[PDB]
Structure formats: structure tokens, C-alpha cells
Amino acid sequence: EFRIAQDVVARENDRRASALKEDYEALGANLARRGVDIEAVTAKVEKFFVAVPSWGVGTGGTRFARFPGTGEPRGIFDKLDDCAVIQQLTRATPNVSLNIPWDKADPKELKARGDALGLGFDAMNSNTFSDAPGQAHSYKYGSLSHTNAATRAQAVEHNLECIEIGKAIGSKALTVWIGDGSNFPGQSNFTRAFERYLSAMAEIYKGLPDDWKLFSEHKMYEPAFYSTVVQDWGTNYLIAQTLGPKAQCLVDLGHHAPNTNIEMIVARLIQFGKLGGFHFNDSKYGDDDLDAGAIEPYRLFLVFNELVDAEARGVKGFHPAHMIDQSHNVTDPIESLINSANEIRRAYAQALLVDRAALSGYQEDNDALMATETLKRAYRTDVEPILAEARRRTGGAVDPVATYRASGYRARVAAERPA
Amino acid sequence: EFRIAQDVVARENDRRASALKEDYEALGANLARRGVDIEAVTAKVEKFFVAVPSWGVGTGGTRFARFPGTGEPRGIFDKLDDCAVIQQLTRATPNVSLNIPWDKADPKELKARGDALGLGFDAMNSNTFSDAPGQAHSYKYGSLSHTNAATRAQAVEHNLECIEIGKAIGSKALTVWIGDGSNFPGQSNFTRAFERYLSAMAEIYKGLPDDWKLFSEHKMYEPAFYSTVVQDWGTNYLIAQTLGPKAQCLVDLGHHAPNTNIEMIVARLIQFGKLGGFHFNDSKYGDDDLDAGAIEPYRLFLVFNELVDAEARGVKGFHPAHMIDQSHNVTDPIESLINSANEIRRAYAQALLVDRAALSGYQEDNDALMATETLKRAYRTDVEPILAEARRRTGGAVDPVATYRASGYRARVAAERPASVAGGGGI
Amino acid sequence: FRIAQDVVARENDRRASALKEDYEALGANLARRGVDIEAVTAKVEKFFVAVPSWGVGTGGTRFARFPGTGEPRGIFDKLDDCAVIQQLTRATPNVSLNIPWDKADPKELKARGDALGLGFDAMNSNTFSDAPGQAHSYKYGSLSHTNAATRAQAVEHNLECIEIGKAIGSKALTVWIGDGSNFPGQSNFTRAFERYLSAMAEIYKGLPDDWKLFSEHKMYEPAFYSTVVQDWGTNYLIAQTLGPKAQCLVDLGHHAPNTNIEMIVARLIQFGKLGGFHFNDSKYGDDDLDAGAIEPYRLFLVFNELVDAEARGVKGFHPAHMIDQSHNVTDPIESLINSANEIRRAYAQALLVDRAALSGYQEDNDALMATETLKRAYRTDVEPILAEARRRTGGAVDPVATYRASGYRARVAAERPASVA
Amino acid sequence: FRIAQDVVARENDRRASALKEDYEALGANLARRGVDIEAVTAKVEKFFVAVPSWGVGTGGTRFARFPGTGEPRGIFDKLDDCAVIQQLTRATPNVSLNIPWDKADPKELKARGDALGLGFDAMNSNTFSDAPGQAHSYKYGSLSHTNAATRAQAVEHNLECIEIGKAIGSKALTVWIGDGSNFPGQSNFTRAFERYLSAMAEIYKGLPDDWKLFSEHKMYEPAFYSTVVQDWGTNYLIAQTLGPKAQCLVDLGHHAPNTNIEMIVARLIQFGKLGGFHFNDSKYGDDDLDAGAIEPYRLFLVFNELVDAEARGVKGFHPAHMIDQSHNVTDPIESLINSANEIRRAYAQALLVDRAALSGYQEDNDALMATETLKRAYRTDVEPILAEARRRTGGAVDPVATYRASGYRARVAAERPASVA
Ligand SMILES: C[C@@H]1O[C@@H](O)[C@H](O)[C@H](O)[C@H]1O
Ligand SMILES: C[C@@H]1O[C@@H](O)[C@H](O)[C@H](O)[C@H]1O
Ligand SMILES: C[C@@H]1O[C@@H](O)[C@H](O)[C@H](O)[C@H]1O
Ligand SMILES: C[C@@H]1O[C@@H](O)[C@H](O)[C@H](O)[C@H]1O
Ligand SMILES: C[C@@H]1O[C@H](O)[C@H](O)[C@H](O)[C@H]1O
Ligand SMILES: C[C@@H]1O[C@H](O)[C@H](O)[C@H](O)[C@H]1O
Ligand SMILES: C[C@H](O)[C@H](O)[C@@H](O)[C@@H](O)C=O
Numbered sequence A: 001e002f003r004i005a006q007d008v009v010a011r012e013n014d015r016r017a018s019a020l021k022e023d024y025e026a027l028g029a030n031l032a033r034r035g036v037d038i039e040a041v042t043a044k045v046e047k048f049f050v051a052v053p054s055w056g057v058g059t060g061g062t063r064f065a066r067f068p069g070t071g072e073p074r075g076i077f078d079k080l081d082d083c084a085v086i087q088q089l090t091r092a093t094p095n096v097s098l099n100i101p102w103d104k105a106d107p108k109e110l111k112a113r114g115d116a117l118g119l120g121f122d123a124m125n126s127n128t129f130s131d132a133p134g135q136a137h138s139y140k141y142g143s144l145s146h147t148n149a150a151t152r153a154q155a156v157e158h159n160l161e162c163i164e165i166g167k168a169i170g171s172k173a174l175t176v177w178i179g180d181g182s183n184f185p186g187q188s189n190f191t192r193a194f195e196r197y198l199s200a201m202a203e204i205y206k207g208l209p210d211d212w213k214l215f216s217e218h219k220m221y222e223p224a225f226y227s228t229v230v231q232d233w234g235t236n237y238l239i240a241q242t243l244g245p246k247a248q249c250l251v252d253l254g255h256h257a258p259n260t261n262i263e264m265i266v267a268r269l270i271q272f273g274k275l276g277g278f279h280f281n282d283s284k285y286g287d288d289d290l291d292a293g294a295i296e297p298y299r300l301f302l303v304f305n306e307l308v309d310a311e312a313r314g315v316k317g318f319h320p321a322h323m324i325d326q327s328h329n330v331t332d333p334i335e336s337l338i339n340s341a342n343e344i345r346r347a348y349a350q351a352l353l354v355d356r357a358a359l360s361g362y363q364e365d366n367d368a369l370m371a372t373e374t375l376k377r378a379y380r381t382d383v384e385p386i387l388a389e390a391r392r393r394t395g396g397a398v399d400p401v402a403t404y405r406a407s408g409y410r411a412r413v414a415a416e417r418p419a
Numbered sequence B: 001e002f003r004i005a006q007d008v009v010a011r012e013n014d015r016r017a018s019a020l021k022e023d024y025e026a027l028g029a030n031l032a033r034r035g036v037d038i039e040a041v042t043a044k045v046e047k048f049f050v051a052v053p054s055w056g057v058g059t060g061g062t063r064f065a066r067f068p069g070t071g072e073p074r075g076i077f078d079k080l081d082d083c084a085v086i087q088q089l090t091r092a093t094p095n096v097s098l099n100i101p102w103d104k105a106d107p108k109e110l111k112a113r114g115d116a117l118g119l120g121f122d123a124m125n126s127n128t129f130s131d132a133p134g135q136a137h138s139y140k141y142g143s144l145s146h147t148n149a150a151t152r153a154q155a156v157e158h159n160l161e162c163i164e165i166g167k168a169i170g171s172k173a174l175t176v177w178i179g180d181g182s183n184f185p186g187q188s189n190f191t192r193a194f195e196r197y198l199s200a201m202a203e204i205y206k207g208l209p210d211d212w213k214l215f216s217e218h219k220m221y222e223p224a225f226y227s228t229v230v231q232d233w234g235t236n237y238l239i240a241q242t243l244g245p246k247a248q249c250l251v252d253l254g255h256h257a258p259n260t261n262i263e264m265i266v267a268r269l270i271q272f273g274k275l276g277g278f279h280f281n282d283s284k285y286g287d288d289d290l291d292a293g294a295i296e297p298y299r300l301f302l303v304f305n306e307l308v309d310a311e312a313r314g315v316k317g318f319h320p321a322h323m324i325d326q327s328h329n330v331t332d333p334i335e336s337l338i339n340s341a342n343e344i345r346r347a348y349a350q351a352l353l354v355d356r357a358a359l360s361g362y363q364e365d366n367d368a369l370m371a372t373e374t375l376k377r378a379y380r381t382d383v384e385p386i387l388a389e390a391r392r393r394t395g396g397a398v399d400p401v402a403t404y405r406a407s408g409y410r411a412r413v414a415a416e417r418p419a420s421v422a423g424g425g426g427i
Numbered sequence C, D: 001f002r003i004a005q006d007v008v009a010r011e012n013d014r015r016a017s018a019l020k021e022d023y024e025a026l027g028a029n030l031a032r033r034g035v036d037i038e039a040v041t042a043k044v045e046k047f048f049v050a051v052p053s054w055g056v057g058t059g060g061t062r063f064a065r066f067p068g069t070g071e072p073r074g075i076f077d078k079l080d081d082c083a084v085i086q087q088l089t090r091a092t093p094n095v096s097l098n099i100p101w102d103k104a105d106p107k108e109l110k111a112r113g114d115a116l117g118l119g120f121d122a123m124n125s126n127t128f129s130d131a132p133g134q135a136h137s138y139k140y141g142s143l144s145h146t147n148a149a150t151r152a153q154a155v156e157h158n159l160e161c162i163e164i165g166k167a168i169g170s171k172a173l174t175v176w177i178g179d180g181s182n183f184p185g186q187s188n189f190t191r192a193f194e195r196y197l198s199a200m201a202e203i204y205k206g207l208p209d210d211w212k213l214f215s216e217h218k219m220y221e222p223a224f225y226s227t228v229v230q231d232w233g234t235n236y237l238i239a240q241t242l243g244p245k246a247q248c249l250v251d252l253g254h255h256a257p258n259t260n261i262e263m264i265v266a267r268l269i270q271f272g273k274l275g276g277f278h279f280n281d282s283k284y285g286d287d288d289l290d291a292g293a294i295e296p297y298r299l300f301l302v303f304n305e306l307v308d309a310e311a312r313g314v315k316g317f318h319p320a321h322m323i324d325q326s327h328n329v330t331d332p333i334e335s336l337i338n339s340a341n342e343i344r345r346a347y348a349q350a351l352l353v354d355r356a357a358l359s360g361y362q363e364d365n366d367a368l369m370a371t372e373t374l375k376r377a378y379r380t381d382v383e384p385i386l387a388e389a390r391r392r393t394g395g396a397v398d399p400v401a402t403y404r405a406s407g408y409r410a411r412v413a414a415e416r417p418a419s420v421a
């Protein structure tokens, strides 16, 4: 089924077909002069997919307030319906990331709806950073690293429950992010809390299917404001290495200290085989969870430069999980997810344009200026024509947001859903 | 009224009286050898007050979750009852800061309850960073700087209402903090938004009594994650200077960029007569709103060093409004506010111990090492006995938190108030 | 001519075909957006940024300096090198001097500049280091030093810089000092600032009627605890206190982590105190890296505020533009060339912004389309416009490639003796 | 004796009575808390931290260096000054050397050290600067340089540092390099690290059975975009890859803004890779300021982890302790004296923490009492313990005061020629 009428997509695409042809052919000629086949790039871009977060489909908020828009999804089923729109128009988000218990519902029904909408499911996300009604033990002072054994056991059981749900819908991985930490010096014994965490994660690893992966996600701060158990990639590496081959690290772009060189962290984790995946978003101050590439587009490109280089260096068995983790506080969530997915493909496309042979030469000769310019020649290239053509060829929209607005989808769901 | 039984306070004080006498006399002898009269210091500490936030007596949370404890205060009246405990035990928080509409209630009743509990009211706090039921215009895209004229007018009216309520309860100032800003480049035109803000603030300024102050509070980010209209002290100064004599700047410790020298900002504002007051708290990463001095006690001392220098260099017309602005997510709000107020008095007392003449000499001679050591000699002094004695002589508790726990107050209000339930934070 | 004309011609001809194809393609795309590429190119060829004399030689850190070959020996060699940057990019007609580093007969400096086709931008005083025969040391400060005679000495130095500038064609004085403290208590913040203000007031008195005085703020370094002119707030107080001729200079790498620099730029413009810019890039501190090499979007956002100012009709707005960088691991001439190019790049993209559309989205609070309006301009590869602007003004289509083809570095390496002690 | 014994005796006697009163008062206070002050003093007396040879001379920034009088030049002058710090504080018996800065005949270094009552701590190699007559430059790196011969030269240099150390009593080699990049693309992160790891393996092979190899991470400077050994995560990978004799060195000012450094310390201890510390304080970047002069509580929290490690009976925990600072506006000897004192101050306060009480509050999630348990120790003025520890071991009750009374600075100023009067 199509959430957006096919006649609307066809109409809006035809309206922009002429200009796209001119832009695509122009870029094709430019790339040909540079020894690059535009068709080879478009072919790869069409195959790049990033999972959308169910928790980002509705309007997000802060501790100060939440300003919902119209037609807010009422639950996971409305969220899947909205996710279907993002995938139909961009063709870059076939899978959805779920969070339990936020999206708890009959697994069988979830799968049925997904299949009908043309959507799959990515990594499951457990939730032991908030309390649910009727919960025996509170996570106020922690979960997997809580001082109380019964509380840790409850958190472990919750994670195993997440795996059972995932197995029923087609998921093949579990992502574990917890708020565990301290707000005051002395509140926690750093080593003992980490020892407790490692023991708990070992239990989860024991219950992990042999065709699944277990991802741990580090974060410098928030909700903990003095110390956090899984605070950075160093601790994250120790966790993954300790647990086993099926355990890897997940890197969320906005979870690092000010000025951190994130692309180097990505490179390091790849070298030691522990880069499990990404949580894309952008930021300026803290874990802002803004639209990917809206603040620092070059940084996003540099991260993708490391991913493409890995393939170029001949790294084997490298298939990181790509996911968007954002909060949309002042825009239509669907529109932001659409453009964010587009920006991620944009950075990927540019990274594919880098002349690896030239770059390697400049690195070996220590020609820093030409090396940086080699990256810039790729990054400065406006790859929008490739992104639009990729969408057009695969059933998507040349201009996703414009088509979304022309369809009147938001007004439609606003009438179907309570205010 | 006495939220805490007098017999409990007397009991816990007597139990620690012996140790206090020993420590106070020892410190007195040490200070005497240093040419300082401990009595003179204690006398000033007993008179240092800081306002408590009504929204701080309840458990706080983040966008991810909120984990309420037992006996959570229901409304402003319950909150005032809890604030009364902090003041009775520390004797450092006689005034309370209100936020409207959160604490909206009959001005007559509010004043009546305060007088009964022995509490006064500090600066009023307007709220246009969240929407209230029945609100005609949403503040989603701003308030005082919103592009829609009707929305700015609605925000101006709300602030004027806050002034009216304050006038009725004895308040003498209005603090304006808004979330106004953008999350994306291009979303807002920085200059146009600021022009709108200034014009709206001018309307609010017109409704200020002749003896009132209007405080604008800067904040680098949150809830806006790309730009904020009142983002730093520079913009804040421009605001105060533009509005008039009654407009001043409020400095909240956790609202600055990483590594900012905050004490210098305080000095600069004092020099140009625009330091309206402070919002005390501590932090390590962002606007963490943690207990004052729990993370960086020396920084708190350095801020007070600038304040005492002004309080010593005879800075005429200098009475900054001191207030605690914190969020208590993992502790009993009352206990944290108690120790936070204590830490603020600790930094103040230590600043009073600085040999100003010696410091001036080392500064003039460019003797950096002795100048810094002159500050350290005061800062390293354990002034707890002075704080404890000040509390004891004024009706407080030698050990506030110990006494609070011995009284069983939390268990009491827990039985009187409905049970709470954990939930989300707004994400 | 520092670079043989035949070389510039040969290299331009080699790349003529490709430039034609790219420029014409871009022109058609811009036309579809309602933008005249010729109007943009005409403005770009007139955008100038001053090159720092102190950035023509290899720079270093407190740990070490690794000089390359043919390092300039003095201001005359430096001007000769600046002439190369201007001949090839045509974006750097003026040079920024530092006294006493570049002290020499004003008449001879002017003669060399005229002969090379170069002018002089704002003078830069130096009271952050001690020169020979100095009566008082600047170890503990200069314009804000506790010792009156030391402040007087610093004032005289700045007045001397003005005299030198008047003789060579300069019209402004930039004052950046290291004054500050490394320990709490070392300085009385307020008194140190008052001392600074009194000294600057004296310097202001020596300003010709058509001169400007720029003060430059910096969060830290060389002072590691407090700095007298630490941020734009203090900087504004300075400018406002001194008078109409006094304005603030914004050096991109001088702000706290995560600071919204483009907002500071807008605030200063609103209150008429944006004197100028010191362009460079950074990631950690005052790194002084090549402009746009680390965060190109931020540079574009700064230029977006500068172009918006014109769009709003701000009157008498002519900020001074200067590059202030340190080239530690590259040929200084090549880095200055590409940095000047990046600045024109950001400027050109800022000119492409559809401000009619942007104003609409801002009024309607359409944050997504507003940000996308800025991105449509920023994502545009304007290299063809920069290259054509150079071709038509006597410059090189590919400046660095032409510089390398000329063999200039090897030439000066043979002419200049390297320092031995 | 660098400082006359009569002067030390006189200045101690002058302050003896006051110390007695303060020590007895603190003794009574600690007694009421169940702690024996004599036990704490005994431990403090045994805590030592190495002094940097490169720290007794006045330091500077890339902008300037303002030397004081009697500047030590050469390792012999430096050892003479380091001897003053040890004599007065009794907390710095060993000196950290840097090669080639301190190159000299080992036989003479040892002879001078023995005569002054000084030993030698970890050796520090230097491949972040070029020495005259060097075959290959380190401009673009050293142990991770793309050129094989350059990496070999750097490895040989480090092996030479081990040879010198073996002859003078050292038992470790600390390796800090500037290797990194200033521009994206300049270096391939992974390849550069592979080159570094291979070179370090060669150095590891030359380590005696009882030696340790310390690698030191640093976020930035001299490299301003990326650094090979940028943080503790990379450092851990290095130590674990090299072998049991390789550990990580933590320099306090080498971390990103707001980093929780004490946790990094705890993590390294848990996995047996905490090799040692480089103490100093900072506010902005790698400021290299006097330890505890900016954030004393943070220093205490670091020592809280060190004391807790022993409380838990950790194995393989014998960290080296060294001061790594730059003294730009103070008498280097006085700053090192007070910095060593501040380190012992934090240690003493960490020893006062009631571990039993703390553990109880941690298990019960009583965050407020847990933090107040740390504060009760930290708020305690342990100066009497530090002064008594010095008095009992031949040191000065008030080190800096005694140093000033001795007239030592004026003495060496008269023996050492400055560049200018
Ligand atoms: C973006 C990244 O690029 C390369 O590393 C591989 O193709 C990998 O599968 C992909 O995820
Ligand atoms: C802003 C924040 O809001 C809630 O979480 C609480 O009222 C808390 O005390 C306050 O600090
Ligand atoms: C006494 C006082 O000292 C400083 O604060 C300033 O110089 C101020 O102007 C003066 O009034
Ligand atoms: C790196 C720096 O170099 C010099 O300035 C001095 O040796 C100083 O002590 C050191 O910290
Ligand atoms: C001089 C050098 O400086 C580095 O930044 C690091 O701190 C090293 O430990 C030190 O030896
Ligand atoms: C007494 C004199 O003191 C100097 O400081 C130096 O150590 C000389 O070597 C010694 O002869
Ligand atoms: C909802 C999801 O678990 C969450 O966003 C985490 O992944 C992490 O980003 C939190 O800061």
C-alpha cells in the first residue's frame, strides 16, 4: 500500500524531471572528466539504507516543555504508518528501530503491519532508564549496574524480553543504552559499578542468539551529571572485548566531549573490529539530537570518509548498522527524518567520490595541503542530482519534502488522530 | 509554626555541643594568630541569606525520566511548608522564589502562609517557556521574541501579571528567563529576534514599580540547541543597558560555555553596575543544576571572592539578589537545599577570611604565587564550626541534615501527601 | 612579476576547457534558481582580504618550529612573497604589518609595496613580547600593567605604530595583548581592566580623523587563568567606552568551545562595533589553521551574517577582513592562497542565498525550509566562479598548481640563506 | 646543602610554636573522628613525586618567554636547583630527565645527583623537536612517520634513552610524541597508528626485565586536527598490545573539556595499565599550571581513586608520580615547591576518607551522605600534617618562606649570566 498517492509522486516528479536531467548530465560529465562513472556512484547510493527511530516519529521535547504538532502518532502502529511515508519517498529507510516498552504490542501484529507497509525492523532498543507502571524495582539509582541484585536481575530479564520480541519481528541485534551513573562525587564507586555492569551484560550475552549482535552505547553525560558507567569509547571497547565476538560498540555522534575527534574513534574501533554501528544526528552543544548534517556537514562527511577507506584498505566482514537517533522539537518529524536520511546519503556519496589513489600518494609524501584538498574536491561536489536520481529510479520522490507537503499527508492524519 | 519539633532541634544540638565548642575555640585561636576575630566573621555569616526555589523542593527530572520520592509537595502551599524546614534548620533561606503560573494562588493566602511560616518572597519568575491550558498562542517558536505580534503581547501580559502578584506579596523584582532561540541555522534572524525581544522587554519595564528591578537571565543553550536570544553576559549587558536603571543581569553559574571564567563576568557586571544577582548551583558538563559546590567548591569560593572584594572596597549601592536554582533528581530535595545553602555560606565565610591588604600588596608587586596563596590560606580554612555556631545562635541546627533525618519529617509528609508515580521527562 | 606571466598563461590555457564546461553548467543551474552568475562573479572579484606578514614564514608551537626552505629574511622578502599570493589569487592586495617585527624605513616599505602592487591594511602593535633596549618588561602585562611607566611605554609603542601606518597608507591600528593572569588572585580583574581602559584612551587620542582602533578579544593564551580582553562582552565595553573610532575585531579561533560565533558577529553589527575579522579555522583552541579546512559551514554562516547586514541596509558597514594564521606543516604561500580562496568561497555561497525565500520561512517559523534555503546555497560548488574571477583579473585558474609549476619556492630557497643561530 | 642548615633551623624555630598548636588541634579533631594523626603523617612522609628537569627554568609560550634572574642553563645548574626543592619539601627526591636536552656523561650525572641527594625517575625521550645534525626531520612525525628511516631514527633515539637511564638508576621510559595531523586527510588514522605500534614494539624489545614503558596520550598540540595517541582509549590499546611492561601515563591537562579524569584513572587501574601521572592544573587546555592552583577538588578526587585502589588490594598498582609543569610568571623553584605540597595535600586528605562509611552510603544509594563523606576529608586543613612531615624529615615548616629568607635566587643570579643585564 502507499501512504502517499502514486499520482502525487508521479506529478511532482514530472514537474522536476527536466531540471534533474540537466543537473544529472552536467554532474555526470564533470565526474567523467575526473575519471569517475556517475552510474557506479548512483548504484551504490541506491543501496545505502539507514534505520529510522520509532521514538523520533512523534514530536520530541526537553525537560522544560513539549510542544506537540498536529496528528501526533498515538502509538507504534501510527508511527509505523508515518515511517512508511519516509521510506516511500526517500527509499533510504526500509527498516525501523523499536524501543520496549515504548513500542510494546503483539509482535505478530507488528510484523504483519511492517510487511504490509514495506518496512522491516532493525536493532531492538531496551529501556531501563525510565520506570513503567507496576514495575517492581525502580531504576532511579541505576539498572544493569544498580547496587541491588534484584534490580539488576530485573533489568537483565527486560533485555531478554526485548530479544524475544525482536526474534518474532525479524530483528538481529540488541542495543543497550542505559543512564546509569552518578550525579555526585562518592555516590558511586567507579570500579564496582562497572564490575556490576559487566556481570549483568554477561548474562544478556549468554541469552543472545548466535545470529544476533549485542551493541553497547557510550555517552559522556545525561541523565547522569557527574559520572556515567559507559561514558566513552574506551570503556565501550573494554565492554565489547570482554563480552565476546558478538558484542560491539555503537557510536552516537552527539555523545562525545566538546571538540572530540569522532572520526578517529570510528577508525580505531574499525581497526580492532568493534565498530558495531552508528546513531546519526548533529549537535553544537551537547547531545542535541538535531537533524543529521544540519550543523556540521563536513564532520559527517569525514566520518563516512573513514567508512569508505575501510573498504578501500581491504577490511573484511565490516557491515556496521546505520541508524538515525534524533529528536524533532520544532519541525514536522517526518520532514526532518526525510532530510536527515538524505543528508546521510549525501555524505556517503561524497565519500565515494574521493580519489583514494591520489590521497594515498599525498599522505605518503606528507603533502598535507593537497591531501586535504583531495578530500575537499569530493566534499564540495553537489551530489543532490545523484540522490534525486537514485530516489526516482527506485520509486521515490525527486524532492521528498515538497512531495510530502503537496500530498497533504499531515492534514490527513491530523483529522484521523485526536488533538 | 515549627515544621521541626523544637525538642528535636535542642536534642540534636546538645548531642553535638561538646564537639562544636572544641572546634570553634580551636578555629578561634588559629584565626586569632592570623589577626582575625572569629566573632566578627560569625556575625556576618549569620546575616547572609539566599533565596530558595519553590520549584526546587520537589524532585526534578530529565527529558528521559523523573523518579519522584515520597511525600512530593502537591502545590505552592506544600512547597512553602517544606521551605520552612530549610529556613528553620539553616536560618540562611528566609525568602522563597515563586514561578507563575506554577505557583499561582490567592496572593492574600500566599502572604498569610509565608508570615505564619516565617518566610518572605524574593524575585518573581515568569514562565513563557511552556504552554499552559487555555493559552491562546503557543510558545513553541518563542515568546517575547516570537515573530507573531499577538504572541509577544500575550507574553508581555503574563509578565505584567507576575508583577501584580509580586506587588501583593512583598516581592521587589521580576526575573525573566526564556527559552527563545533556534535549533537550525537560518530558522531565526539573530538581529530581528533580538530587536523583537528588546521591544517586548521595554513594555514590561514600563510596568515596573519605582522600587522594583527587572532581571534578564542569559543561557548558552537548552531548550534551544543552535542559537539562543539571550545567550551570554554580553547580550545580557546590552539588554540591561538598553532597558534602563531598573534592569540588571542575573548570572546562573551553569549557563556558560565550557571553561568560561565566570568570576570575571561577575567582576565586569559589578564594575558597570549591572549585576542583579545570582542563581547558585554546580555543574560539570552543561546546565546540570547540581548542588552548589558539590563539584567545584573552589570556583564557588572564587565567585564569592569577587563579591566580598566589592563588599569590602565600599561598592555603594550593591545588594545582589542571591538565589539557589537547582534540580534534585537523586536526593531528598530538602536535604540538598539545606547543604547547598550551607555550602554557599561556606564560600562566603572563607572569602571573608582573605587578607585583603596582603592580597592588594601581592597584586601590586606582581607576586603571583603569594597572591594565589593568600586566597588559598582562606579557602583551606575549615569554617564549618563558624557555620554551625551561626546556626545554633540563631535558632538553627548544628547539623541540619542529621537533625532533619532525626525528626522523621519526610516520613510525616509522605503519609499526609498522595503517593507519586515515575514517568517520562518529555523526550 | 614574481611569477612569470607566460607560466600563468600556460597553466590557465591547460585548464580553460574544463573551466568553461563547469562555469557554464553552474550558470545554467543558477539561472534556474533566478540567480545571475555574472552578478555573483562581479562581486567575488572585488572581495579582498589582507594577508598577515607574520604568516608568510613557517610558524611553530612552544614545542618546536620546523622551517622549510627559502624562509623570508625580513619584511622585504615577506612582501615579495605576499606579491605572489596577490598575483595568483587577486584576493589579497593588502598586507598587515606587525611592529617591531616589520619595522623599517616607512618610505622604503611604501616603495616596495607600490612596486609590487600591494597596499597596507591595519597596523598591528606588539606588546606581548620584549624587544631589545626596552626599559620595562611586559612579562606581567603591558597596557594594563600595574606599573605606570610600563603602561606609558606600551602607549608610546602604539602611537609609534600609528605614525608608521600614516606614512605607508594604513588607516587603522589593531591592538591585541596577552595581558592577564595565570593564577587566581594574581590580578584584580576590575583594576586591571581600568588600567587598560586608561591606556587605550590615550592611544585613541592619537588617532587621525579617518582612522579606526580595533581591540581583539581572546579567551586564553598566553594567560591561562584570566585575560583582560577575554571575550566580545568585554570587547564591546571597550569600544563603547573609547568612542566612535573604536570597534571590535573578531578572530574566529578566540572563543570558548561550542560558542555561536556568527551570533556574536550579528550582535556587534547591530550595535555598530564590528570592526573586522581575523580569519582562520580551528578544532581545539586558537589553532590558527587554514580558513575553512576544518569547519567550512561555520565560515559560511559567518558570511551569511555579513551579507544579511547588507540586505538589511546597515549603513557605513565596511568591516576590515584579514587572515591571521600559522602555517606549521605546509608551504605558507600555498596555505595563504587556498585560505584566501576558501574565504571567497564562503562569501560567494552567502551571496547565493535566496533571502526573499528565507525571510518568508523565518516569518512563518518554517525552520526546516529556512535551514534548507541556506544549504541550497552552501552546497553549491562555486569553484568555477572563483576560478573565472581570477582568470579575468590576471590571476590563476588553479593558483597552487600554478605556484608549483613556477618553481618559485626552489628559486627563493637558493636566494635566501637559512638562519643558523 | 643548597640552603644553609642554619637558615632552615632558624625559620623552623620561628614557626615551631604555631605549628605545635595547629598540629595538636588537628590531632584532637581527627581523634574524635577515629583517626590517628601520627599514622597519617607517617604515610605523607613517604609520598614522593618526581620533579622535571625542564621545569626549574622559566617556561614560555609560542608568543614569548620572559626569563627571570639566575636561570639555570644545562642539566648541572638544573640539578642544583632541583636539590633546593627536595631539601625544603623532602617530597621530591628524584628528577625526571629529557634527552637530548639533559645529555651529559652518565657518570657525572650520577655523581652530581648523589652529591645533591637526588635520584633519577623515568627517562623522557624527545622526538617532537629536531636536534642539530639530525639525518631525518620530525616535522611530519617520528615513531609514526611515513618514512621508514625516520621511524628507525626515532626508535634508536629511544633505545639510547634506555641506555642512559640504565647507567643512572632509572627504571622506566616515558614516550610522548607530537605525531598527528593539522588537516583532515593529511594522515590515514589507522595506518599511522599501525606504524606507531610497530615502532613501539621495537622499543619494547630493548627494555630490561625490571623496566616499564609508559606511553602518554594528549588530545591536541602540537597537532591541531588529529593526534596518534589522542586519548586513554588509544593509550590502553597501545599498552595491551605491547605487553605487561607497557602501561599508560595520565597527564591531567591532556583531556577534552569537562572530561571525568578520575574515572579514567579508575578504569586504567582496573585493567592494570595505570603506569603513572603527570601532575599539573589547568582551566582551558594543556595550561601546565601549578598543581591544585585552579581545581583542588579534582586533584583530591584523583587521589581518592588512588587510595581506594590500595583499600581494595589492587594488584599491579605501583604508579609513578611526576610533576609536569611550565612556570611562566613565577620563580620556578617556588612553584614546584608549592605544587609538590599541593599533591601531598590531596594525598593526605584522601587518606582521611572514612572508607567504611563511604561504602555503606554507596550501597544504600545515599548520594548526599556519600558526597559529604568525601567532603569531610577534603575540607580538613591538613597543612599541619604537611608541615610536621617536613620538619621531621629535614625540611622546612614553610618552604617558600624559608626559600625567600635564604636568598637563594639572588645567589644563583650572581653566579649565572643572563642574556642581558
Ligand atoms: C558506509 C560503509 O562503507 C563501507 O565501509 C562498506 O560498504 C560498509 O558496508 C558501509 O556500511
Ligand atoms: C527545570 C527543572 O524542572 C523540573 O525538573 C524541576 O522543577 C526541577 O527542580 C527544575 O530544575
Ligand atoms: C575602590 C574601588 O577599587 C576597584 O574596585 C575599582 O578601581 C573601583 O573603581 C574603585 O572604586
Ligand atoms: C613545554 C614547555 O617548554 C618550555 O616552555 C619549558 O621547558 C616548560 O617547562 C615546558 O612545559
Ligand atoms: C614537554 C612535554 O610536553 C608534552 O605536552 C607532555 O606533557 C610530555 O609529558 C612533556 O615531556
Ligand atoms: C658554590 C657554588 O654554587 C653554585 O651554585 C654552583 O653549584 C657551583 O658549582 C658551586 O661551586
Ligand atoms: C531512545 C534511545 O535509547 C536513546 O536516544 C539512546 O540511544 C541515547 O541516544 C540516549 O541519549
Ligand SMILES: C[C@H](O)[C@H](O)[C@@H](O)[C@@H](O)C=O
Pocket (backbone or CB within 6 Å): B055, B099, B125, B177, B217, B219, B252, B279, B287, B325
Ligand atoms: C525555573 C527557572 O526559571 C529556570 O531554572 C531558569 O532560571 C533557568 O535556570 C533555566 O535554565
Ligand SMILES: C[C@H](O)[C@H](O)[C@@H](O)[C@@H](O)C=O
Pocket (backbone or CB within 6 Å): C054, C098, C124, C176, C216, C218, C251, C278, C286, C324
Ligand atoms: C600576530 C597577531 O597580533 C596575533 O595573531 C593576534 O592577532 C592574536 O590572534 C593572537 O593570538
Ligand SMILES: [Mn+2]
Pocket (backbone or CB within 6 Å): A177, A217, A252, A279, A325
Ligand atoms: Mn543513541
Ligand SMILES: [Mn+2]
Pocket (backbone or CB within 6 Å): A259, A296, C295
Ligand atoms: Mn566542531
Ligand SMILES: [Mn+2]
Pocket (backbone or CB within 6 Å): A252, A255, A287, A325
Ligand atoms: Mn542520545
Ligand SMILES: [Mn+2]
Pocket (backbone or CB within 6 Å): B177, B217, B252, B279, B325
Ligand atoms: Mn536560573
Ligand SMILES: [Mn+2]
Pocket (backbone or CB within 6 Å): B259, B296, D295
Ligand atoms: Mn572546570
Ligand SMILES: [Mn+2]
Pocket (backbone or CB within 6 Å): B252, B255, B287
Ligand atoms: Mn538553568
Ligand SMILES: [Mn+2]
Pocket (backbone or CB within 6 Å): C176, C216, C251, C278, C324
Ligand atoms: Mn588574531
Ligand SMILES: [Mn+2]
Pocket (backbone or CB within 6 Å): C251, C254, C286
Ligand atoms: Mn590568535
Ligand SMILES: [Mn+2]
Pocket (backbone or CB within 6 Å): D176, D216, D251, D278, D324
Ligand atoms: Mn606530560
Ligand SMILES: [Mn+2]
Pocket (backbone or CB within 6 Å): D251, D254, D286
Ligand atoms: Mn603536556
